[PDB]
Design a protein around this ligand. Structure first.
Ligand SMILES: CCCOC(=O)N1CCN(C(=O)c2ccc3ccc(-c4ccc(C5(N)CC5)cc4)nc3c2)C[C@H]1C
Ligand SMILES: C[S@@+](CC[C@H](N)C(=O)[O-])C[C@H]1O[C@@H](n2cnc3c(N)ncnc32)[C@H](O)[C@@H]1O
Ligand SMILES: [Zn+2]
Ligand SMILES: [Zn+2]
Ligand SMILES: [Zn+2]
Length: 423
């Protein structure tokens, strides 16, 4: 019995709205992908199937493109890789765009799969394509993707009857553009892209009453606010660490609407997150493009080197609430942890905390995970009372954002127990 339902909104397409009133932390919907794949950066770094990291993955000897956690995980993936394998074989060496791999998976799934649980509320067919709002520049890229797709699937897809009835690839890529989910791991790094057609009913709010979490490819939708009956459910499409001007551009370019929520109307927090000297945080914003790029490929030592040159720059420095400064910190903390530099990690981590509290209000899973990592590092260097309070704050957030159904909450429980026993 669903707590949520599909409904037609006055001015934002087809919405989700609560059938029963809801409490924060309440599980509202859960779903596996209609189709999904690994992102370009994490190819060969994570298992194609469960998206988990390992030092040595196996690989498909047919393709040699997809790689795997294990025999189990390679063989379970086979039924939805097998028509895709033939395509990237003969496309050796030219790996296709993520969106092109994703659409390939959709077409296979829609041709050869039983109807998916992912289309229960809303189907791929029903997805918004925002086509009467696309700019001529966006459309040019769309047909570039169509031809990219065509070349890419040529040995598996030749004609229209190898597709769904009246399937329009140009229309499909348009849907993909404004409905794709960036799948992130437990530690909150992007490890994939996927589609979840029922979850795509949720419209954006720059201050939402719902959130979504990824547990591998599995997505859980929870309420993060009190919700009453008939109220539309919202999620933030976007990184919390953006100014309203940055949200405006991204909402225009990717999702084709203007947002006139209260936070955009008042440039809420904009001034705070651009404190410090303009020239300085623009360099750092420029540099962050490489830094975030290196991170997308898990090149951790190269990440840390760049980050230190900013955080301990001889030249002028930025306040930690500067979002681009704050972002460097996040990248540096994650780098140290995956480099085993735990003291240096905690140091960046603890600095992020008061700014994170400000920019991730209520219960946000990015915060919960950060606070747990901070508690994790304090626990280990033996700082029990501070860690236990942090692991307790982390739990207060993640109970709302992750829940029993999410496995990371089970790990957080282990950490609470151990530190509490230590005390
Ligand atoms: C329906 C189509 C429109 O909806 C969407 O496209 N959505 C739904 C909302 N969704 C997020 O919830 C999202 C999902 C996965 C994440 C993974 C990592 C981090 C993340 C990790 C670290 C940081 C920082 N180091 C800066 C703090 C920031 C974010 N965020 C993530 C946030 C984005 C996208 C899936
Ligand atoms: C993932 S979908 C949300 C479901 C969509 N309304 C539908 O009917 O299929 C993204 C699209 O919904 C619309 N949308 C989403 N959030 C919005 C908002 N806050 N205001 C106006 N339109 C919005 C935009 O057309 C956007 O491209
Ligand atoms: Zn293969
Ligand atoms: Zn796996
Ligand atoms: Zn807004």
């Amino acid at each position: 019995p669903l707590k949520v339902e599909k409904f037609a909104t006055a001015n934002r397409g087809n919405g989700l709205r609560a059938v029963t009133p809801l409490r924060p932390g309440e599980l509202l919907f859960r779903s596996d992908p209609l189709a999904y794949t690994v992102c370009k950066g994490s190819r060969g770094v994570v298992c194609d199937r469960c998206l988990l990291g390992k030092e040595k993955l196996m690989r498909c000897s047919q393709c040699r493109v997809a790689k795997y956690c294990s025999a189990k995980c390679q063989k379970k993936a086979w039924p939805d890789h097998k028509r895709e394998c033939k395509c990237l074989k003969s496309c050796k060496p030219r790996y296709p765009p993520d969106s092109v791999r994703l659409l390939g998976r959709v077409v296979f799934k829609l041709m050869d799969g039983a109807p998916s649980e992912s289309e229960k509320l809303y189907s791929f067919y029903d997805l918004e394509s925002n086509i009467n709002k696309l700019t001529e520049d966006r459309k040019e890229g769309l047909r570039q993707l169509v031809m990219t797709f065509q070349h890419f699937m040529r040995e598996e897809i030749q004609d229209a009857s190898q597709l769904p009835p009246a399937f329009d690839l140009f229309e499909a890529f348009a849907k993909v553009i404004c409905n794709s989910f960036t799948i992130c791991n437990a530690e909150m790094q992007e490890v994939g892209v996927g589609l979840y057609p029922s979850i795509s009913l949720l419209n954006h709010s720059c201050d939402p009453n719902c959130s979504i979490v990824f547990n591998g490819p599995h997505l859980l939708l929870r309420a993060v606010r009190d919700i009453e009956v008939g109220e539309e459910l919202t999620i933030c499409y976007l990184d919390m660490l953006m100014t309203s001007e940055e949200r405006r551009k991204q909402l225009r370019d990717q999702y084709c609407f203007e947002c006139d929520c209260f936070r955009c109307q008042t440039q809420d927090k904009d001034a705070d997150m651009l404190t410090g000297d303009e020239q300085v945080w623009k360099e750092v914003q420029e540099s962050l493009k490489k830094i975030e790029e290196l991170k997308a490929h898990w090149k951790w030592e190269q990440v840390l080197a760049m980050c230190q040159a900013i955080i301990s720059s001889n030249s002028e420095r930025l306040p930690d609430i500067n979002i681009y400064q704050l972002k460097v910190l996040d990248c540096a903390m994650d780098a140290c942890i995956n480099l085993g530099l735990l003291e240096e990690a905690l140091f960046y981590g603890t600095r992020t905390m008061e700014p994170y509290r400000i920019f991730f209000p209520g219960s946000h899973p990015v915060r919960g995970v950060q606070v747990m990592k901070v508690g994790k590092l304090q626990l280990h260097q033996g700082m029990f009372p501070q860690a236990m309070k942090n692991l307790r704050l982390a739990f207060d957030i993640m109970r709302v954002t992750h829940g029993r159904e999410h496995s990371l909450i089970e790990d957080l429980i282990l950490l609470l127990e151990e530190c509490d026993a230590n005390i």
